[PDB]
Amino acid sequence: AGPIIAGKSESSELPRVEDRATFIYIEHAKINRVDSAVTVAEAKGVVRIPAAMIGVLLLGPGTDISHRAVELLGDTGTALVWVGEQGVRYYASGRALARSTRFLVKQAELVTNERSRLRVARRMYQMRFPTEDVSKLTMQQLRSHEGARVRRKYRELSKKYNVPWKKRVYNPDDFAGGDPINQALSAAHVALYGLVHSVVAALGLSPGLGFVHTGHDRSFIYDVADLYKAEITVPIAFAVAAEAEEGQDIGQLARLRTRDAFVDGKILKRMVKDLQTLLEI
Amino acid sequence: DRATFIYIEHAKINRVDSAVTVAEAKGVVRIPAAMIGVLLLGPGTDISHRAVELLGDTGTALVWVGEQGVRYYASGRALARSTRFLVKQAELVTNERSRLRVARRMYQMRDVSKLTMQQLRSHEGARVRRKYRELSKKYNVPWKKRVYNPDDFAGGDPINQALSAAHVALYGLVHSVVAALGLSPGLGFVHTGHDRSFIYDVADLYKAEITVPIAFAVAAEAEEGQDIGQLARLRTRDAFVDGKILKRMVKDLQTLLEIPEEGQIEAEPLSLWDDKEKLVPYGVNYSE
Amino acid sequence: AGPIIAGKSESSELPRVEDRATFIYIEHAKINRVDSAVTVAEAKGVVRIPAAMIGVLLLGPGTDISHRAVELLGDTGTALVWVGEQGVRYYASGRALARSTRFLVKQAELVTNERSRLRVARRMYQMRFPTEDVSKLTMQQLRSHEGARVRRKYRELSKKYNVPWKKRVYNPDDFAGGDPINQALSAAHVALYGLVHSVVAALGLSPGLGFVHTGHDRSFIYDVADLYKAEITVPIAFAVAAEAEEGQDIGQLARLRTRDAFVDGKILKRMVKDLQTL
Amino acid sequence: DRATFIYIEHAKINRVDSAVTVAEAKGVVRIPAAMIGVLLLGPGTDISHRAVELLGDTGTALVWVGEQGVRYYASGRALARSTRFLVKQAELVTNERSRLRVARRMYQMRFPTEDVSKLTMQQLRSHEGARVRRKYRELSKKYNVPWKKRVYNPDDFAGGDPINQALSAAHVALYGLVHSVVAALGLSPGLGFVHTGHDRSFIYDVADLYKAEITVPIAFAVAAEAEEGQDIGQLARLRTRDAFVDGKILKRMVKDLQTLLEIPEEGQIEAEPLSLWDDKEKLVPYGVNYSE
Amino acid sequence: MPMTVITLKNVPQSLRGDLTRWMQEIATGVYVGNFNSRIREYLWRRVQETMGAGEASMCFAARNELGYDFLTENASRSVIDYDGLPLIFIPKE
Amino acid sequence: MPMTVITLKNVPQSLRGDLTRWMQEIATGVYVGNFNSRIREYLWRRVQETMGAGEASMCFAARNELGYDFLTENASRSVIDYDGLPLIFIPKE
DNA sequence: GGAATCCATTACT
DNA sequence: AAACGGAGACCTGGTCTCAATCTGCGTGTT
DNA sequence: AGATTGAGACCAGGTCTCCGTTTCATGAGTCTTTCCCGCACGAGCGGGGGTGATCCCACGCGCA
DNA sequence: TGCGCGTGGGATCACCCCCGCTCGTGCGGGAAAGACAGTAATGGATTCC
């Protein structure tokens, strides 16, 4: 091919969305690009994140990121998500990773048709709950029926793992993260939230096209993430809350447990394999 | 209906209580974030996570670009957490009846009511062919023909390199603009099959008016012995400094999407070190 | 464990016998030990041999090997064979890699008993030709069977590849020949001869306790090599000579293809199982 | 039926026309290959391929040993490529009746004056433990070295009694040559009679015929003549290797191995431990050339 | 996925950081990662032209006994085969 | 079948030639080879005890999505676990 | 017969 | 406000060469 | 003689700083179809490896 | 000092762990032609120098 220069590479030279790691949490560091390399710099020293195999590069509190750093990360295709306490805060992404918009245009056909929207919206449920029939359940009931089911799973947890539950379904907009239980689930939740945004920009899908959540440009993310919302991360993170000790940071070990759940559950393989089925390709 | 497009380069942004704090070499700027929608973050800028904390609350969109959009690098959320613009784009692209209407509207922006998609496409090639012929004699330059190697830019004609360098600047600007507005570059009307399909469709509006004369101008004064992609980039940089192009483009997208005039949003540039007198009455503290 | 010293290691540190490479072919160079490293100093430079992953090493004409190098190689379990022209010249082995002698003591019991030697020879032959039934057959007419079949295998393969013959059967003793087929047979064969010598010493099995052959201290390796030479080394030995052109190093081409034959045939894993059942 | 256990160290060897040459610092010599029975290759020696091919056809046993055979490193084929001793060993070890015979035979050299040919293995090993206590005690009082009990640790060589460290080093020093002759004669080191289950099992049984006569007297002597803070492992090897210089002990193993294997006296070969500069006058009349 | 390792010396500092996006830097001029066949070829292709005047050698899983093979260009140590076996050759200075 | 690379700096020359019996030398102080779990663990003990005062690090395949993990002893380039990932850390003076 | 011109003659965007 | 290329400049750390040294790494009835 | 150690010279590569120069590596007037390249899952799925148990003298020693 | 075994101690016969699972498929990726409604350059039909 043509000349290859530092920081620039074709999508062929870069690993596919499946062969990459999940995420990295960052806190109190400056992200600067030196010698054409992303370098997260802390007080003690510098660490070179291997961007090529990063799903999403989570960004925490008290951190600074330069301009060429975002450009270098965008070229790699790793998503950038700003998170702190009380829930997720901001999203970012590069241009793309796949040059074919076939996935996007197929999604465009599906969203516009009301008949097509109802077909796919019901099909969320049997991927969430394969033992129930939603063949004759309307769009309005979908919001209410799934709204009760997500609450039921949490209620089952409270009596199961023997730890108090605040009865607060995760709403990322100005969420209540006071009690250590809440940050554990939220930090677990933002891990997939960054992951879901990471793959969607990689495959060319647009987060604006909503299925069950509507009104915001992150509607598609809030729906795909809802597919695996309670199946994988919720039992693992809540079980972490049961195995809680004092004198250590809950977030770091909880994030580690979500990592093991993600690799054990093959979330990256399952999620895109679904989207291929979800688009009838 | 008020949209603020602010370009920041060679500076640093932090937060104190509720406003972003630009720390450029001239001084400290205290723009409130309650009325900010776009941060055209230029080269060599530093953003603080605390600053990003507020911008999410107001629906402000972040875009990372080069010299005021000469190239597009990355973006974020949309204006005021609004996805209606993209929704109409999806509606306008599925059925070919809507697709043909906007495609015909795109051509007349550059008779259209009877030309079909292939019929429209041939004319655009004809008109663009005449435009190259006209400027070649107008600028008295020896343009043989548009011959280009996509994977070999160094080996090529200076005029061909000039157009290639000039064009790629334009797509970056529109991509930065369209990403902020909340649309999707994949959903193209005439162009289709690429992640920037919508980009090359919209950018065709201003290729003849802006970039092509710039590419021919730099080629006319081009001297053998130096690169011209840098020269073409700067000749686009100053042309993009004014920001009247962005004002035209945001209106064109609303017209292209048949946005009602009442619902149409007007966007204007804000140069912090050049529009000080305008920003002071809105509650901005300036320091040196 | 105790202290660790450079140049010395336990059996556990060394890899398993069948998990290593087969052989290397070294000529016109001096083998020395510098900085606790087996090194081959050729005319233009030096190379370092990963002795842990090496089964048997070979030495051709015009080479020199130092006393310290021998013991360093012997510690790793890699045996030494002086691969001169006209076939094998001499052997060399170090301490047995295997700590126990349960394999060795069982071999002694089987080899010394005439009926057990008969039974083992029955097992040895049927691996070569499983189709035939050798329930009632003794030592004297065995040697007729293998010798004829090897000749028959040699003849039919020669015509299949159209190579001239001198009607000779290959033995590593008192061999000779200027025709390219002569050294092509030797070079391919000797790698098998070296490989079996290394592994048999690694397992702790003495080479003098042969069954088909008897009369020398390397009888056992000859008998084991007889089991696999017809199956493996002979087809390539004829194949490489026919494929080779004039003015070319037949041995380099010959040894290269035999290494592939050792890989795909799973010879190392197979024979250790074969020695297990013998 | 004479085998030459000639020792080579600090020299280069090659081939000129038909006889092996030696390139030691003192001079260059041209010993014929026919005379060579066994080359005890010591430290600081290199071997040329042309020498080996001239040595392979004549059946010479090339053994790589330590300084004067203090240690064993590696070896090639047996002398004259024969294996009659090894096959004899296998026959005499497979059956208990010969195992009874040879096991009592070894104790006969252990107790030349006392007949224990009727004592079973349990009594033989029992009375074997009796003599070792006396020999340690008797030599302890002779050299005024305080002796308590055989105490050591294979995983901890440094943390040992100076008497024990010398004793352990002395046995390993003798283990060298006694394994070298076994490999030179082609015997299987694995097939041991008293000791069984280790690749050196045959070596320990043969070496025990000389441990009470060489190693223990040397080890006790070294322990007395040793100052604090000085490592004795090299001292024990150096003191032992002095006894190997003459080679008189070397003939003893050669004769003994035939005696243990019940080889007929005519078939009992006897080795001659030659040395280059020790027997210059002896080699020259046969046809050896000595050049400065 | 099979492992891969890259070595570098006397190379412009632009590349020394660029490859760190793919493979981390355990030591000076040493990079390690787990890549398939397609990805590794393109990265080696990247180092093919931007190495400048220096050394670059790479190792990866192969289909021989040792299970790895070497590729070198403009290298102090050439790679020589002994009957199909990759062994490092250090030329005499 | 797993792969393992070992890097060294400022170590006695006795050990530098020692792993040449297990590894090969693609570059100075850089050794690479293929082991199982048992052989690699045992050898890492050897380079741990004999290196004395020096630099020693190694890369080996692991059970994480990165596909490998890091073990370091007396290493300037330490390793920091970002919730289950091995990343090379370089202290700054 | 061939040049100049037109439309086929052939072919570029 | 970053961030990279070129020109030192200084350093450790690897490598070669020349005396001095040892022949080598230790279990086998307590 | 060969190999190791140590002391000492020696010098190339790495790294740091300082100064200067950039804000960059450069397509599509047009999409569609079709020949090369794919690598994870589907079908019945038993050859390996980690290791408890234990022998019989090694460490040590008690009565005799 | 006579006499053996109280703790081992790791290979090894063989026990239960593992995926068993590797070629074809078919699912996406290419890349190169190949269309699609237009001029430009140029040569035969027509007529004139």
Author numbering:
A (entry chain F): 2 to 282
B (entry chain E): 20 to 129, 134 to 311
C (entry chain C): 2 to 279
D (entry chain B): 20 to 311
E (entry chain D), F (entry chain A): 1 to 93
Which statements did the authors publish about this structure?
Here we reconstitute CRISPR sequence capture, processing and integration by a naturally occurring Megasphaera NM10-related Cas2 and DEDDh fusion protein (Cas2/DEDDh) in complex with Cas1 (Cas1–Cas2/DEDDh). The Megasphaera Cas1–Cas2 retains the canonical heterohexameric architecture, with two Cas1 dimers (denoted Cas1 and Cas1′, a or b subunit) bridged by a central Cas2 dimer.
Disruption of a single A–T base pair and DNA unwinding appear to accommodate the strain induced by this pitch, although this assignment was made with low confidence owing to the low local resolution at the bending site. Bending in the centre of the CRISPR repeat symmetrizes the integration complex and draws the repeat/spacer junction towards the Cas1a′ active site. Although PAM nucleotides are still present, probably due to their cleavage-blocking phosphorothioate modifications, the overhang nucleotides typically sequestered during ruler-guided trimming are absent, suggesting that 3′ trimming occurs in an intermediate step between the linear and bent states. Binding and bending of leader-distal repeat DNA may lead to disengagement of the C-terminal cap, which covers and protects nucleotides.
